[PDB]
């Protein structure tokens, strides 16, 4: 996360950390949607261009963490993966269209003051909240600047959703209806962006009607980080809700 700040403890209890077992490595962010299901970006698990194709046994997820590194004994929870489900139409070849994956944990996690699921949007939420100009919130332990350091505490940044034509004209990469972009425009007085390593993390919004947080997007891709005239791209969670439901109902 670039130009964000340290999160308050328990501010994002659905935050999940995707960890490679060997060598030990922080791969991406993810989010808790139930006691057995974690949502993340497909490219965090499968990306052939980078010779990346992790299987269940190669990974572990960490839930309830605040610091990056510090062992938060009996607060954080480490879970094994029972199964990985990547969207069948995930386009790793061209533009990361449908950059989404689900991970089912071997055992249900116990919720706590630091571990709690986020809501997934329904039609009404998507229609009312995913509008240009409204701000959402992105969190992650990814890069603090465009590079190639890393934060010691989870970072958070609030960013406004950008009009689709502007997202489209800001890049030569083909954008789709399964993505949305966010970030401030040049000279608006504020900056900020997700960055490498933040993928899989949630872009959430708080409903003004019921006080609940909904995960509207998944950090997916960008070009550089926090560059003027460029915007971060996110997987449009509601556009892919039907697939999410299908997997959870079927397993």
């Amino acid at each position: 996360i670039v130009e964000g700040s340290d999160a308050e403890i328990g501010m994002s209890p659905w935050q999940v950390m995707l960890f490679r077992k060997s060598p030990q490595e922080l791969l991406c962010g993810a989010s808790l949607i139930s006691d057995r299901w974690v949502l993340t970006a497909a490219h965090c698990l499968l990306y052939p261009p980078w010779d990346k194709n992790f299987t269940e046994n190669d990974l572990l997820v960490r839930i309830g963490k605040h610091s990056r590194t510090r062992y938060e004994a009996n607060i954080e929870k480490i879970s094994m993966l029972e199964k990985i489900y990547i969207h069948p139409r995930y386009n790793w070849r061209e533009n990361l269209d449908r950059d989404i994956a689900l991970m089912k944990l071997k055992k249900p996690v116990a919720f706590s003051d630091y571990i709690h699921p986020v809501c997934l949007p329904d039609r009404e939420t998507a229609a009312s909240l995913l509008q240009a100009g409204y701000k959402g919130r992105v969190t992650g332990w990814g890069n603090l600047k465009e590079t190639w350091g890393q934060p010691s505490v989870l970072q958070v940044v609030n960013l406004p959703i950008v009009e689709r034509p502007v997202c489209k004209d800001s890049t030569r990469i083909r954008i789709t209806d399964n993505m949305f972009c966010a970030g401030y425009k040049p000279d608006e007085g504020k900056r900020g962006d997700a960055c490498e390593g933040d993928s899989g993390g949630p872009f959430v919004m708080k409903s003004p009607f019921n006080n609940r947080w909904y995960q509207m997007g998944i950090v997916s891709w960008g070009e550089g980080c926090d560059r003027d005239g460029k915007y971060g791209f996110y997987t449009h969670v509601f556009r892919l809700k039907k697939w999410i439901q299908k997997v959870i109902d079927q397993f």
Binding site: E8, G10, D113, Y114, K135, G136, R137, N158, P208
Partner: peptide, 29 residues
């Protein structure tokens, strides 16, 4: 929706985090 999206240390305790107001005000601006 059960209990989804209501944070034990914030919504459940009627406490606002430091910047959520920025998000709510953005629905206007």
């Amino acid at each position: 929706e059960a209990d989804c999206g209501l944070r034990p240390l914030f919504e459940k305790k009627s406490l606002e985090d430091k910047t959520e107001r920025e998000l709510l005000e953005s629905y206007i601006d």
